[PDB]
């Protein structure tokens, strides 16, 4: 396919173009509410914790897909393990309201609790970067609320229903070697 | 009818001496345009013809168990060759015929076979090779055996260099007996056509 | 009486990637609207086709270029998600997370040399199968191949089929894989005329029936 | 929906289960759609 | 309030065979088609029935041979499938995966003599209620049996019939039974015509209503 | 039964050709689904363990089939008793990928873990011999994943919706005694 | 299907529960239901 490039028009070209033929293709796995749809760690906690998906490792199959993104929308489930009972403030609550049994709080049931939770952020959407203040940094007001227990053991973080908009860079690792990047891949013993 | 010609391109055999042909694990072939050639896969018919070899010589003194083998694709120094050497993918099945001529007054039995996957059988293994596409050869009845059997294996197209799925395994059943009006030995000698070969990627020269 | 159940050993521990969901506890929640938001993207792969990201050529440069009029092997790259040359793509980015692939991966070169400047090029797809990659375009020709010249239309896009064994191919690369399981592609010059400093610039899309399956999370974490 | 495989229904009210949307389109999705094939200009095969 | 159970007592712990699933945890995967793959056979037994495996006899020949032409007792054994001369055999390998079995069991006999020589052959189904398995033709020829010579068809088969008393019989042999619990088989030379050196091939497949029964593990481990 | 042996056609002949009648038989023990479908033992194990079914005893009923196949199919289910939690990484993946939980990761619940996977080798079915290289032993992309814990004390494997092509050899114990295997058969006591 | 017998459907999707086959056959079902049986020539019974 000749075409002009500087135009920026997609252009997909085929096999067909010299004799082959394009096959079947199933793409559920890199669909975006599926693949986003999993728990991955939060691993920097406090007893006081505030939720936020940006504390997820940006290198991480979630952290990574969602630093991929400028925007975004999604539900959450959690999973906490921790000591003495846990308490959920939503998003804009004082830090106070914590200590408050009249939160939605989750008494101890070994060995940790599961909660789903609705988004309630006052945005219609949510950013990964942000281009201003709001008093680089994001502002306070992006958030999933905030958790607190004795004491936080461990914390994952699941998306629901997420949506993208606006595809940011995505990478993989730099390769040194000058040819490709090897690893050892899993093969059967012996 | 015990007369039967085969005919493999411009190359016919006719055997006077045949107790039919065995077809293995199908009749037809398994689909040969799947995905993993992406449409670029073509026929080569100047390839699907007989070529020869000579597997040994049955004597007296081999006794049960004595097996003889040959692995596929062999070398071959035709059109068959040259494919496997100018295609990165190929796949075929085979159109094979094993003689072994000596007279009536000879006795003895061959076990004439097709395995996938060559292992080296045990001893105690070789008396179920029969669980494998075959025919016997016994001089009292016939001079030849005739076996087909398609293309098969873990990858829809193959690289023959790296793996051959298909051996020919020639394994003495009960030990050739002589007569004085008998032969004293019997040269055993196959007689393949590589057969519905499609080939794909064509690779660049060597010089 | 009651419903007696068998509680069940093996059933029951938390799995972070089952297909339940969590008990809800906290209702009547509605969102602000965000109808018609610009931007969206529902699948990985519509990006993927239809944003070609840039090459990485030695010295870090997403084109190649050469100074002499003679015939020559412009680049040689591993058929390989895991190519130092794909290293820095969207697509490379994307495959990562993903053990699998099949399909047609699009290469577009883009000449940016000035109108006195003309070149004819040549990319070949070179399948497994021999020790090392053609050095020349007459011994590349045997292989399948397009080439083309420059002209009114800057951009040329090739597709490298998928031609394997197995129906699908592994994203990563073995470290004992020598020679790369896939094979090479080959960017040649043919010749050219006045374009010494002039480059092409080459980048990266999936193709129509591009695949990713099996999602993996593989990074050092 | 997405990584969610139960046959049967949930349990909860969706009012519960998850927040819900309010109103007052997936552009990638077009953006490849539209993306050209083939070749430009005269072939001769 | 909510539903009341009773966590069951006795119930609940994992059996190796239970007729239950496990839960899911990975979704979506497709697999590469494998429509028509040659080959497949879906019980055991249609393989069993369709090709014959060898018998065992002393020496490890699968064959029998006299070099005298008087009347002869070839070979005798016991109709069980841990017969020492069953060893071998595809159906024996299979039967050891089974407590039980019944009907019947086909041997095939197939001569390899040359054209000129020629024999005469018997087989007998000795049932369980004498001592010792019959010496003579004569004597065997009260039993179930079946006559054959050489000629043209190379190959003779026959049918061994379950003839019991229960309608089942153990596929094993137990330590404590000395004589053989469901009888013997008998081949028998009646005469021949200068076979001399010439052989009786001998292999066993299953019969129509052969029937195994009750998986086992058996094997040391 | 008199047929031409050379040949190798099948010939089943019955009881009827001396009189007697061919009774009714029930095979569903011998239907190959049913047979496999049942767990085994996989024995050599350590922390880091890829699934390849070709570890199975030998002699067992589900190793000495499945051996007796030379081409087949089929899901899994696994049964693992563990310290730590586990992490199951597909076919294809680098080794690497076991240290983190976006992978399938069952959190420890006592007495172990049972798990539900699906086949994902790149090859529209595997084999249980193979004559040739990949670069005798198996390739290694013949394997259903792998599976990492702390410790991996046990680990069963049960074969579904089992499918087995081409029949190799099955052999029972060899007999020295001249007429009859024999063994202790289980019998009441006293 | 093969040693699972439960009368109740599974709780989870199929898509869930296992692979999923696609297309682009018992050959020893076949094979043994083709063999001769009786006899073959004259009978005297």
Redesign the interface.
Known sequence: ??????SA?????????????????????????????????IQNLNPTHVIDLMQT?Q????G??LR????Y?S?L?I?VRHDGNLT?V?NGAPEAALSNTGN?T?YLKA??T???????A????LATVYNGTSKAQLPASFNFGAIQATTIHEL?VRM????????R???????S?????????????? | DRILTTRNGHTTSTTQSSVGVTYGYSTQEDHVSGPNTSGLETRVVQAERFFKKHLFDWTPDKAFGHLEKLELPTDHKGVYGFLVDSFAYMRNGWDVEVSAVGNQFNGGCLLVAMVPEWKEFTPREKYQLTLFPHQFISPRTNMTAHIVVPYLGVNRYDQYKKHKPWTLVVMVVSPLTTNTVSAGQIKVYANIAPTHVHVAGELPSKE | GIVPVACSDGYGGLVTTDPKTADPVYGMVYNPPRTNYPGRFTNLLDVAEACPTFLCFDEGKPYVVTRTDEQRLLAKFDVSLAAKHMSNTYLSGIAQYYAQYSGTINLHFMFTGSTDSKARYMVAYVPPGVETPPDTPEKAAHCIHAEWDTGLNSKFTFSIPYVSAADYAYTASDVAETTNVQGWVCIYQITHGKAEQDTLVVSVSAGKDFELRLPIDPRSQ | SGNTGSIINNYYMQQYQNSMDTQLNDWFSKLASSAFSGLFGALLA
């Open positions: 396919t000749t075409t002009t490039g500087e028009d997609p252009v997909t070209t085929t096999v067909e173009n010299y004799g082959g033929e394009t096959q079947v293709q199933r793409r559920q796995h890199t669909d975006v509410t599926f693949i986003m749809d999993r728990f991955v760690k490792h290198h991480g199959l979630v990574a897909l991929a993104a400028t925007y929308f539900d489930e999973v959920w939503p939605p989750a060995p940790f599961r909660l789903a939770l609705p988004y309630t006052p945005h219609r959407v994952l629901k229903r997420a949506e993208l908009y606006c595809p860079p995505l990478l993989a690792v730099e390769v070697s000058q040819d490709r990047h090897k690893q050892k891949i899993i093969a059967p013993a012996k």
